[PDB]
């Protein structure tokens, strides 16, 4: 069916539940072996969510080379994400090894650092200009350049030195501020602005390393972002734009990691953005 209309008749009949449980069971299940070692237990957030094997990102280190993210490779899209998890106290060293490594020119960041009273991710860049962040683990140094603070988002531009080679690059820090403790946006007018202006800065383009998208678990307003930009981009390219098939498109994502989309909620969200999103590209 097309979109817009199989969202009318989800809506009317109320089955959004019944329409992301099939999602669920039709889902890949691949091995994440690597994920589950001991030694690992402490570069994980959650218990549940892991990387597989086949799609995960290796760092570029000989003692240990695991990370929790993963590789999205949108083959007729011509898009990769790296999908990963908000980075941990003893993890945000190997963070930034893995943006300077695949030669990101983007972070997408949609959690604030604390939600519902809790920690969600580490403070994982500077503040302040002139007190600047040295990562000894993986001999980094990062430095905030410049910050654009909007009502729905902020902006940073950030210094990423490579010490060993004394190398630098500047890296973009998009961050959606205002994504609600509990449920979804009520409208998508400003998620949508904001994947626009990642697009328009570079950072999802071929001639850069694929974009580092987290939230606190980094598979569901993650999956969000990724699913809407794809879906819009095929929409753009085919001949017959009514032909995009949402549910399709997330069962390829989830190919490559697991739990994309975490509520029907979310799900309904997406289409809605995709909706919207696709009466303004024209
Ligand atoms: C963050 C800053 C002040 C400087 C910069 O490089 C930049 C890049 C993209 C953007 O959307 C806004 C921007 O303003």
């Not at 998508?188 to 328009?200: D, G, Y």
């Not at 009514?242 to 994309?260: A, N, P, Q, W």
Request: glycine share 4%; hydrophobic share 35%; net charge neutral.
């Amino acid at each position: 069916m097309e979109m817009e209309k199989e969202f009318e008749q989800i809506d009317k009949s109320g089955s959004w539940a019944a329409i992301y449980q099939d999602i669920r069971h039709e889902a890949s299940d691949f091995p994440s072996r690597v994920a589950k070692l001991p030694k690992n237990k402490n570069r994980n957030r959650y218990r549940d969510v892991s990387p597989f094997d086949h799609s995960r990102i290796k760092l570029h280190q000989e003692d240990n080379d695991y990370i929790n993210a993963s590789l999205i490779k949108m083959e007729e899209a011509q898009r990769s994400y790296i999908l990963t998890q908000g980075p941990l106290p003893n993890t945000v060293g190997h963070f930034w090894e893995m943006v300077w490594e695949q030669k990101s020119r983007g972070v997408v960041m949609l959690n604030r650092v604390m939600e519902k009273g809790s920690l969600k991710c580490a403070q994982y860049w500077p503040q302040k200009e002139e007190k600047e962040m040295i990562f000894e683990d993986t001999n980094l140094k990062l430095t905030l350049i410049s910050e654009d603070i909007k009502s729905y988002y902020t902006v940073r531009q950030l210094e990423l030195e490579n010490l060993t080679t004394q190398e630098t690059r500047e890296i973009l820090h998009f961050h959606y501020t205002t994504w609600p403790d509990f449920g979804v946006p009520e409208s998508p007018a400003s998620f949508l602005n904001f994947l626009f202006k990642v697009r328009e800065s570079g950072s999802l383009s071929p001639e850069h390393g694929p974009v580092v998208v987290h939230c606190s678990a980094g598979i569901g307003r993650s999956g969000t972002f990724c699913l809407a930009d794809t879906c819009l981009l095929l929409m753009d390219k085919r001949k017959d734009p009514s032909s995009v098939d949402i549910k399709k498109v997330l069962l390829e994502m989830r190919k490559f990691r697991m739990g994309l989309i975490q509520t029907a909620d979310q799900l309904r969200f997406s289409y809605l953005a995709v909706i919207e999103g696709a009466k303004f590209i024209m």
